[PDB]
Amino acid sequence: IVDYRINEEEFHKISLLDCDFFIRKPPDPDNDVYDFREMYVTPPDTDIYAIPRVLAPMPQKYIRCAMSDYGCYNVTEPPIDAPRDPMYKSEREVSKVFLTKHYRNRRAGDPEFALDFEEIYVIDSKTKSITRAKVVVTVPGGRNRDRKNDLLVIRDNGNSFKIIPSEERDDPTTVIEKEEWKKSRQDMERHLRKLRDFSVSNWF
Amino acid sequence: MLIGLYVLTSGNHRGICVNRYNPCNRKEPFFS
Amino acid sequence: LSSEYVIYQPEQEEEELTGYELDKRLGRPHPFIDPKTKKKIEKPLTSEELWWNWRKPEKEQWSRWQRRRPDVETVFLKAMAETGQVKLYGDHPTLTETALYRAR
Amino acid sequence: TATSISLGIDDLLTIPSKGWLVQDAEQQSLILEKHHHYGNVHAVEKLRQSIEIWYATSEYLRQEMNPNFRMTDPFNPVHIMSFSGARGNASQVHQLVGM
Amino acid sequence: AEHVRAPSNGKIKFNEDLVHPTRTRHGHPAFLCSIDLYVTIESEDILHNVNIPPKSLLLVQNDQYVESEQVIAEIRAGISTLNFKEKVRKHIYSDSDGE
Amino acid sequence: NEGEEVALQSPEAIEAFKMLSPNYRKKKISDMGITEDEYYAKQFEIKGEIPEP
Numbered sequence: 173i174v175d176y177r178i179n180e181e182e183f184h185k186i187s188l189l190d191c192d193f194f195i196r197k198p199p200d201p202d203n204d205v206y207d208f209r210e211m212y213v214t215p216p217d218t219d220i221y222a223i224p225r226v227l228a229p230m231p232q233k234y235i236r237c238a239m240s241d242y243g244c245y246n247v248t249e250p251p252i253d254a255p256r257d258p259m260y261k262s263e264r265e266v267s268k269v270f271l272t273k274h275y276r277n278r279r280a281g282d283p284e285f286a287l288d289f290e291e292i293y294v295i296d297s298k299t300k301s302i303t304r305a306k307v308v309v310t311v312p313g314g315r316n317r318d319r320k321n322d323l324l325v326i327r328d329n330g331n332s333f334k335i336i337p338s339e340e341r342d343d344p345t346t347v348i349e350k351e352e353w354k355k356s357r358q359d360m361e362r363h364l365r366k367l368r369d370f371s372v373s374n375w376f
Numbered sequence: 377m378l379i380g381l382y383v384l385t386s387g388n389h390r391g392i393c394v395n396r397y398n399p400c401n402r403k404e405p406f407f408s
Numbered sequence: 409l410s411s412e413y414v415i416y417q418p419e420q421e422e423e424e425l426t427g428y429e430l431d432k433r434l435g436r437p438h439p440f441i442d443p444k445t446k447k448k449i450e451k452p453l454t455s456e457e458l459w460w461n462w463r464k465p466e467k468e469q470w471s472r473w474q475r476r477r478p479d480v481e482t483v484f485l486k487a488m489a490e491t492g493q494v495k496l497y498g499d500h501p502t503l504t505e506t507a508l509y510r511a512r
Numbered sequence: 513t514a515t516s517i518s519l520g521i522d523d524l525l526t527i528p529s530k531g532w533l534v535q536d537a538e539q540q541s542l543i544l545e546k547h548h549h550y551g552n553v554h555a556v557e558k559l560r561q562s563i564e565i566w567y568a569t570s571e572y573l574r575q576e577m578n579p580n581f582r583m584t585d586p587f588n589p590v591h592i593m594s595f596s597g598a599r600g601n602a603s604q605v606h607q608l609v610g611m
Numbered sequence: 612a613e614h615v616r617a618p619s620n621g622k623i624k625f626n627e628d629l630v631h632p633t634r635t636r637h638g639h640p641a642f643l644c645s646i647d648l649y650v651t652i653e654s655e656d657i658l659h660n661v662n663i664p665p666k667s668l669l670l671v672q673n674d675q676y677v678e679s680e681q682v683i684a685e686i687r688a689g690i691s692t693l694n695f696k697e698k699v700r701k702h703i704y705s706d707s708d709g710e
Numbered sequence: 711n712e713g714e715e716v717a718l719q720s721p722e723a724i725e726a727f728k729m730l731s732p733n734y735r736k737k738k739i740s741d742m743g744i745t746e747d748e749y750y751a752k753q754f755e756i757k758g759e760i761p762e763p
Contacts, residue, residue, distance in 0.1 A: 304413050
């Protein structure tokens with residue numbers, strides 16, 4: 173606990189499921205400049221500030237980043253105790269926030285604008301920690317690869333980051349069918365294992 | 377009517393039933 | 409020069425050229441148990457050492473369930489085992505294969 | 513009316529392990545009868561063993577009935593009628609496709 | 612009274628010194644279990660560990676080979692006083708004449 | 711004599727439980743030193759009081 177109440181007007185307020193993250197914002201025309209020198213984490217809608225867990229080397233200079241949100245929608249069924257009581261309740265339930273630095277700190281309105289997928293900072297509400305993501309560049313070109321053709325694939329609950337070309341992508345139907353087929357194969361093998369003839373058998 | 381509703385909302389073959397091989401080596405209709 | 413976080417793997421040369429793993433990945437006809445990884449288990453207790461409750465009868469008794477119940481699944485598996493559409497472990501379809509066919 | 517669900521003879525699917533279970537149960541019953549004739553066990557033990565083993569076999573068959581339908585033939589008409597709630601029960605379907 | 616069944620075909624390996632010998636109600640010999648034990652079903656590719664600490668009946672022996680879904684043990688954890696307990700009597704009838 | 715589904719504590723009951731296995735009988739035969747033909751005849755032995763010749 174810092175024990176002093178900061179002025180949240182000069183900070184970036186990022187809301188999470190169980191936490192609120194504050195990052196100092198330098199004066200800028202477009203609110204996309206972040207200062208990672210001063211940062212605080214608070215309980216949900218609480219004015220008791222604290223120091224977050226810095227688990228990775230944080231940038232010590234002003235950088236222009238793009239915020240994103242990661243989570244799952246919780247569509248519940250609230251009890252109906254009134255005539256016009258709502259039939260459903262939908263919540264975004266953000267879990268991880270991704271900060272993607274702009275290439276060369278360029279503005280969004282510039283003629284050449286690209287996102288630097290090599291410097292990703294994630295924020296976790298469960299662990300109350302901010303760390304730097306580990307990406308696996310696989311696009312040919314090394315460090316001279318053009319940033320106008322890049323695709324960042326995020327899987328495994330925000331733990332796997334890969335940079336692949338834009339043309340080499342899979343449609344949503346493909347990945348959905350892949351995961352469904354994998355789960356179905358695993359469950360079918362689990363079900364058929366208990367049969368006394370599973371040993372002398374063949375999956376066709 | 378319960379049988380009809382169950383047939384309507386049952387679903388579709390999702391895993392090994394819909395495809396013989398893994399789609400890794402490799403839904404379609406879009407309606408507005 | 410490269411940082412700990414920024415990994416570089418330009419050459420993707422990881423291929424499961426082994427037949428069993430390739431068929432398991434691509435969903436091709438392959439045995440459920442890898443024949444290479446099969447381990448010969450040691451000899452268990454003989455019929456004499458087991459108790460009388462678990463001791464099998466010396467002469468094979470008669471039962472109405474000694475034969476295998478005929479089914480459409482077995483006939484269709486025998487029909488499609490020919491012409492090379494599917495491959496079965498042996499010459500006669502087993503119950504696990506009949507269930508898999510009932511599914512697919 | 514459009515789908516026209518129906519039930520047939522081959523549509524009553526038994527679990528793929530009924531034969532093995534019934535065979536081992538009757539084998540144990542015959543072994544126990546032979547040993548009862550020898551004098552190793554008395555009448556009440558034979559009665560308890562038979563009742564318990566057959567009740568356990570029937571209960572295991574009824575327990576494995578539903579997962580078999582869900583995994584192997586999810587769109588089975590009997591399974592649809594039982595799971596939807598239209599007509600039937602687990603006990604009643606056990607009489608049809610089990611024991 | 613839940614019945615533990617073998618997950619797959621294989622040999623049973625356990626330490627017989629911890630279990631106490633006893634006689635089951637079915638006239639069969641078994642090992643009484645009173646402490647949490649670990650038994651291993653040794654199969655071609657995998658090992659399985661399933662057992663429950665409280666008073667149970669082990670109807671198998673060490674190094675014995677068992678097939679899938681056979682009754683390895685009987686948990687028998689459910690035990691309580693029965694107010695409806697009845698002293699039912701059964702008679703044994705002679706099957707041959709003599710002295 | 712002891713009961714049903716109770717841990718056997720009598721020495722003769724545990725002895726018979728171990729004797730239910732053929733290997734234990736073979737081990738006991740080897741320990742006693744008698745032959746198999748002698749062990750077969752030991753079963754057919756008159757027990758109780760034996761009259762004087």
